[PDB]
Amino acid sequence: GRYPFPKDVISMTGGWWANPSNWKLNGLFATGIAVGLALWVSTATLPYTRRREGITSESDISKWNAAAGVWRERHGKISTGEA
Amino acid sequence: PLLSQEDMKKHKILLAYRDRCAALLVPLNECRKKNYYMPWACGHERHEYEMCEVADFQRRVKAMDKLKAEK
């Protein structure tokens, strides 16, 4: 069941069977802070979100690969296993 | 009919799936996308691709039969 425990021991977890007499009002405060933090961050991190594909166009991709080939030709660059 | 290289890229077929009938893979994957990969749906397309793979594996077992016969 239960047993005696030293009352002077203060732990931020509450200690033994912590069940404060005003726990419902502190609970209202806690849930208010919870919704506030969750909503604030959900909105704040919204601009840093994006999808994986469809961000750039095929134009950019193909032109970048072509530019990379141009670079590899200006230098003397064979391909992997091309030997 | 064997798919065009361009078509096969355009549909973004996986490399291991790119075979003589990725042609039936394309509609099957489109159906599987419209429905939410639910088991009961896409039955016809799923069966169609499987029947490809039947013919496909069949030519393979015959090729191994011929190879075996040579020895």
Binding site: - | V54, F57, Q58, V61, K62
Partner: protein, 52 residues
């Protein structure tokens, strides 16, 4: 715990737990039956894909 070294009484179990047991067992058996019926050829192994 009235009786010791003696035959035990029939256990008392809540109505809800018996009803939950009946539902779970009925559902599992019925689902298994449905699955075997629907997949019998493929799960048992039939229609060999090799050429005859």
């Amino acid at each position: 715990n009235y009786k010791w070294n003696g035959p035990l009484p029939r256990p008392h179990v809540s109505a809800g737990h018996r009803i939950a047991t009946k539902f779970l067992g009925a559902t599992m058996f019925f689902w298994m039956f449905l699955r075997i019926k629907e997949e019998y050829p493929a799960m048992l192994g039939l229609h060999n894909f090799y050429p005859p």
